[PDB]
Amino acid sequence: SSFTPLVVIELAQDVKEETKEWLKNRIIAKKKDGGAQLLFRPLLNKYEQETLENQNLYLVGASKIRMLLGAEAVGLVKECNDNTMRAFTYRTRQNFKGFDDNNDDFLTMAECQFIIKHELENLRAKDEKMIPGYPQAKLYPGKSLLRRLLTSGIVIQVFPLHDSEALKKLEDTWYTRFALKYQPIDSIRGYFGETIALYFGFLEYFTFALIPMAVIGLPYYLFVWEDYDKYVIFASFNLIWSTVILELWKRGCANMTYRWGTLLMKRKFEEPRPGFHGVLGINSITGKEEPLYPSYKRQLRIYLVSLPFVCLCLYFSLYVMMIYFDMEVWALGLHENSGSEWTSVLLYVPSIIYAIVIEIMNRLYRYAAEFLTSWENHRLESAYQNHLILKVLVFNFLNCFASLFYIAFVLKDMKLLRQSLATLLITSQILNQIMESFLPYWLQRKHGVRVKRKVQALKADIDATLYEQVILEKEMGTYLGTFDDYLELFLQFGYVSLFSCVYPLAAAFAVLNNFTEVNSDALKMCRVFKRPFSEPSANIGVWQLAFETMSVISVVTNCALIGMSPQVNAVFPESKADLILIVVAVEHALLALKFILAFAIPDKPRHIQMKLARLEFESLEALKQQQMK
Amino acid sequence: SSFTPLVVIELAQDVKEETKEWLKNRIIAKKKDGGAQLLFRPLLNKYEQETLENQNLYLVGASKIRMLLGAEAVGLVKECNDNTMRAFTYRTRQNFKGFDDNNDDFLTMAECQFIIKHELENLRAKDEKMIPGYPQAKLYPGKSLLRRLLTSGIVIQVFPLHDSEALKKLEDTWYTRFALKYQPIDSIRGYFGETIALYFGFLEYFTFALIPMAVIGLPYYLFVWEDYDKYVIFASFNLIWSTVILELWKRGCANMTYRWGTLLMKRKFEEPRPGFHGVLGINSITGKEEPLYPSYKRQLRIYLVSLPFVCLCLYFSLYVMMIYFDMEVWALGLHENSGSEWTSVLLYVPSIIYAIVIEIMNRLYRYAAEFLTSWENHRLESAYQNHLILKVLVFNFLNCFASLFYIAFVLKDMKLLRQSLATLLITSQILNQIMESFLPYWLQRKHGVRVKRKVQALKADIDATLYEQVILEKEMGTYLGTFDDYLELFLQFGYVSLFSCVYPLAAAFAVLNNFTEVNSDALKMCRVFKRPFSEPSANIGVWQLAFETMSVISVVTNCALIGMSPQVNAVFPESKADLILIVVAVEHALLALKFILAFAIPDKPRHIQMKLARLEFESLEALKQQQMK
Ligand SMILES: CCCCCCCCCCCO[C@@H]1O[C@H](CO)[C@@H](O[C@H]2O[C@H](CO)[C@@H](O)[C@H](O)[C@H]2O)[C@H](O)[C@H]1O
Ligand SMILES: CCCCCCCCCCCO[C@@H]1O[C@H](CO)[C@@H](O[C@H]2O[C@H](CO)[C@@H](O)[C@H](O)[C@H]2O)[C@H](O)[C@H]1O
Ligand SMILES: CCCCCCCCCCCO[C@@H]1O[C@H](CO)[C@@H](O[C@H]2O[C@H](CO)[C@@H](O)[C@H](O)[C@H]2O)[C@H](O)[C@H]1O
Ligand SMILES: CCCCCCCCCCCO[C@@H]1O[C@H](CO)[C@@H](O[C@H]2O[C@H](CO)[C@@H](O)[C@H](O)[C@H]2O)[C@H](O)[C@H]1O
Ligand SMILES: CCCCCCCCCCCO[C@@H]1O[C@H](CO)[C@@H](O[C@H]2O[C@H](CO)[C@@H](O)[C@H](O)[C@H]2O)[C@H](O)[C@H]1O
Ligand SMILES: CCCCCCCCCCCO[C@@H]1O[C@H](CO)[C@@H](O[C@H]2O[C@H](CO)[C@@H](O)[C@H](O)[C@H]2O)[C@H](O)[C@H]1O
Ligand SMILES: [Ca+2]
Ligand SMILES: [Ca+2]
Ligand SMILES: [Ca+2]
Ligand SMILES: [Ca+2]
Ligand SMILES: [Ca+2]
Ligand SMILES: [Ca+2]
């Protein structure tokens, strides 16, 4: 009753006492009795008439030997004394670096909350056919208790607790408000898990990978050096540099994910996602009882409902693009009509209105695609994430770059392309930084001041540092994965690299954004959202394919912008049939050299590959010594 | 002394008696005494004055429990009773299908010879600093005995024995001399290992994958249907069909290699190859003692000696191409000079001479590249094979298709392109089938008749069925891997798919070749060569990338041949700048649709993926039950 709280479970209001005692008896009971062996506590041992509306919050922690056995059960990969990353076991626990028998600093709070979430997830029902007290909670043997408690509306949320004394010491070394500074990815990892640290490492890498593009492209646009090289040197430098940074990110990510251990953590078998419903049956792979869904019904629900909706949304995005171009022609006629002083500022208004309409339509399509992909009854979470990423990537690519493609390849007017690209990039980045972190931080500050003034007017002997913290973090927003935060970088790379020939200055407009975003997203993790659960990840995932596809599409787009400028057309003034052949030959040579650069450089580095080969050879020698005895 | 001989070891002539008794004491001795526990025998217990020149051949076999323990040591994957492919262990040996305690039909002769070769390979020296009787044989602890006996010229060759009563029952169902017949890949596997069976399965697949190309392209060339579709339907059909067959081969190969078990055999750690010499030192990965070579010396020996030699050989191939074109112009002038009757046959002579010079220069470059890649001191065998495949593929692509590229894209004369492509393909295939299998089979028949007539004039009580067989198979040729046999199919796919627009009939010229090659290569494995050692292989390897690169290059080549025909140029007679743009757009759409087809179709099939997921889940449940106890 004096332990450290790690995970808060918030029950619903209308929850009977029998379900509460049954959940408390299924949490505290030992691992041999079908429980989880976690220390359980109410938020307050006593209650008064004021705090009766907060009577459902419960705290879950455990003891040290329980956390070490849970780390054995999860499969954490820690550093041994001989500079080797091996899986953690309780029988071989003395081989690991920084471990004592009396050390509470071995497993960090992020790993402890991950272990408690994994032990609450692996809390299955064996004998019970229903939840005691609730009729409709259909429980089959082999079904997780927490998933059915979350879907049926009994457990509202399970969230870990922020540590207000280790978050401040992270924030002191995170906000690079003064100048350039290397981001502390290891402390970000030790506080937030590995997925958030991999995102912040990718953002720190992508910031320091557009700096050669911005530095080369800043006098290339101001001093106009397009006369001397005629768009051949700079375009080749941009495309080769994009391939080089997208391969060296894979090398640095292999180095980082070996340094944390998640390169060696095995692939855990995935449970059906919360919201996959079928008929009860025998799972073919595992042999246990699971919901089953026929695959032809899922393929019909995709290829007859989702794909026509995606095509309708792409057509509606093109229709809004045509409305914007009619508005642009109307504003140009109004500039031709009225005057000179107020009719130059009037040309920047419809692109700003179009950027706001783009950032509204993207969120509306995001809600529609989340509903339409949660409707197709996807089994795993990886397949649901892949389908959602495909839908959102296709519509966001079309809706963001359709007007720029229509300016560049139909109107062929580079001045309007420069103006529209700069206005779209700057307005979308500013509205992204306002709606993403700053306005939710202001609303969170207002809510925190209100919760503080409510807690200070109390009539009980409450230790305020814990109850006040749990009440404040109950009403915070949850983190919905690192999907929008990679999508913003994908659209930044799209605005930079697709039209870097006709407008390299936009690359600088990414770097001056990222110098804020490294701060801003950090604030979004620190004072805006709840603490996310730690998730091990070995790579960025499917985003590597998306960034490489962007870098491949930008080859064709950059060469088509080379073959339309007045600089290259002065070389071939009369014969426009050899210009297309030379531009297509340069484009195919750049694609071949890009694929040769992506295939030649190895993905893992040299010493990481040697360490994985040593880790394989030690297991092979263990197998040989088991065979020999 | 009455066992079945499986592996023949041929010693050299000048070998002292002490080395023979030391090798015999290191073979027969048990596994705990540092030996191999194999039954060893001389070829003949007695010798007369006639057979004294064949006194170095020795036979190696073993007993049944020894072969089962060696199958446990190797890691064979056999079928359990519950339709599951698990690794073979002697303690769990009763779970497997078709196994008795008194059954000599469980492990086939190919698997037994592979196990005996693996036990002779894993015969290491511990105490001895040199081979007893030979001073220069430098032996370090951790060095294989058979490798040092092979490199120092004491053991001449180690080869398995043909089974003359199971080869006939394979040959009865292999030679499809009558008509079309499905090739027995499982019996080919059970006799020849998995690599030869994967090659013959790929040849059987590639024969039945050019039949739609030949059947569609036979009236497309005779009835000239190029007027109606204008090269758009047929080219798209060819490129989509090449992508579809190169993905369905990966699906069928996953199915076959799961059906044999080599999809689940673990990657064995590779010893340094026979001919990698450096300085003696500590291996960083394994920790034992190995030869070490500095990587910068190897990179210098590649990028300063090998690459200039490859560039010089490509320049010499272009110079021989220019000599052939001067000869072609001279023969055309001679046809203009002399007459009509004998001056039409004279146009086919210089292309035949060029095909013979191509097939001579390819073998000369193959010898030069084998010497130049065995000179760079490559450590593993996979790296040596990859470098040799790169050199031979680049030179053979250039030397075979340089004249056709010069006709198609410089001269732009489709009649000479049809004549030269048909003559090069037919003459190269005929000379390939003559020099590959038929002439070595005739020489082997002559040598076998001579060896038979020598053995029948004997003066001893020799059981002739074994000694005669070992003497005949001593002087046969060895199989140098499945590299030339995939290279022939690569060049066939190059001659078919690069110029399938202007000459689809050549696709038929592949199928009428393969209907012989399925027979001919089979004869090359049956009555020409020694029995190859069984090698497990899960795929064709790097040849998938080579066939996909050929299918990608053929998109650009087919579209460049579309944009030069008189059929497509009649659509755009005046504006030749929109024709190039439309052809390049069709080419990029075909490349995008080809990559979408290669990414959309999964590599492994559905049920193979379910079986691998079940095999992973059973091991995860075993780990969980080990953790719970
Ligand atoms: C151009 C983009 C610029 C982006 C800048 C982003 C960063 C701005 C804010 C930096 C300081 O961040 C600030 O840190 C302090 C702690 O030191 C936080 O304070 C909070 O925690 C402390 C410590 O428990 C409490 O005493 C305090 O009452 C509470 O409000 C505050 O809520 C946060 O706002
Ligand atoms: C992946 C395929 C890549 C292809 C890349 C090239 C594609 C387009 C090539 C042809 C367009 O190239 C060129 O474009 C311009 C418009 O910008 C056309 O017209 C313009 O030419 C110049 C441009 O300063 C002006 O002097 C002229 O008055 C105007 O008509 C021109 O007739 C065409 O020749
Ligand atoms: C892997 C294979 C790689 C290469 C494949 C592609 C090779 C394409 C080679 C094309 C060479 O063919 C080349 O075509 C251009 C038109 O485009 C010709 O150009 C000529 O005709 C065009 C059309 O009437 C005129 O506009 C132009 O002023 C004139 O020079 C040129 O004389 C010829 O030499
Ligand atoms: C278009 C291309 C056509 C390719 C045709 C390829 C096949 C042609 C030969 C087919 C028959 O193959 C033939 O089989 C017999 C066995 O039955 C072989 O005979 C050999 O083994 C048998 C059995 O131990 C011995 O009795 C015999 O003395 C020995 O020569 C012979 O060497 C081989 O040549
Ligand atoms: C990846 C890039 C792919 C590009 C594909 C297209 C490349 C070449 C395009 C231009 C060549 O297209 C065309 O070729 C022929 C030669 O075959 C040229 O010349 C010929 O045209 C026709 C061909 O029956 C004849 O009537 C004429 O007398 C002759 O000069 C023509 O001027 C050019 O217009
Ligand atoms: C991801 C991006 C995908 C698309 C990228 C490539 C887009 C290229 C679009 C090019 C359209 O530009 C198009 O160029 C051709 C020349 O090539 C022009 O053609 C015109 O000029 C040329 C040159 O003087 C004349 O030969 C021809 O008879 C005339 O019609 C045409 O009027 C214009 O409309
Ligand atoms: Ca932002
Ligand atoms: Ca962000
Ligand atoms: Ca790579
Ligand atoms: Ca042949
Ligand atoms: Ca062959
Ligand atoms: Ca695939």
Author numbering:
A (entry chain B), B (entry chain A): 13 to 641
What did the paper state?
TMEM16K is a widely distributed, but relatively unstudied member of the TMEM16 family. Here we show that TMEM16K is an ER-resident lipid scramblase with non-specific ion channel activity and a dependence on calcium ions and short chain lipids for optimum activity. We present structures of TMEM16K solved by both X-ray crystallography and cryo-electron microscopy, revealing a classic scramblase fold, with extensive conformational changes propagated from the cytoplasmic to the ER face of the membrane, which lead to opening or closing of the lipid transporting groove. The TM domain of TMEM16K is C-terminal to the cytoplasmic domain and has ten TM α helices with TM3 to TM7 forming the lipid scramblase ‘groove’ and TM6 to TM8 forming the binding site for two Ca2+ ions, seen in other TMEM16s.
To understand whether TMEM16K can adopt alternative conformations and how changes in Ca2+ concentration affect the structure, we obtained three electron cryomicroscopy (cryo-EM) structures for TMEM16K in the presence of (i) 2 mM (‘high’) Ca2+, (ii) 430 nM (‘low’) Ca2+ and (iii) in the absence of Ca2+ (in 10 mM ethylene glycol-bis(β-aminoethyl ether)-N,N,N′,N′-tetraacetic acid (EGTA), ‘Ca2+-free’). These data sets had resolutions of 3.5, 4.2 and 5.1 Å respectively. The low and high Ca2+ structures are remarkably similar (mainchain r.m.s.d. of 0.42 Å); therefore below we describe the higher resolution 2 mM Ca2+ structure, unless otherwise stated. In the groove region, this conformation resembles the Ca2+-bound state of the mTMEM16A channel, and the recently published TMEM16F30, afTMEM1637 and nhTMEM1629 closed groove structures. The change from an open to a closed scramblase groove state is associated with extensive movements of the cytoplasmic domain and several transmembrane helices, leading to the ER end of the TM3−TM4 α-helical hairpin blocking the ER end of the groove. The closed scramblase groove has three distinct sections: a hydrophilic vestibule on the ER side of the membrane, a narrow neck and a cytoplasmic vestibule. The hydrophobic neck is lined with residues from TM4−7 (Tyr366, Ala367, Leu416, Ser415, Thr435, Leu436 and Tyr507), which together form a physical barrier to lipid movement. There is clear density for one complete lipid molecule in the 3.5 Å closed groove structure, lying adjacent to TM3, TM5 and TM9, in the cytoplasmic leaflet, a critical site for movement of the TM3−5 unit. The first unit rotates and moves up so that TM3−TM4 blocks the groove, while the second unit moves down, providing space for the first unit to rotate. These changes in TMEM16K conformation are not caused by changes in Ca2+ binding, as all three Ca2+-binding sites are occupied in both the 2 mM and 430 nM Ca2+ structures.
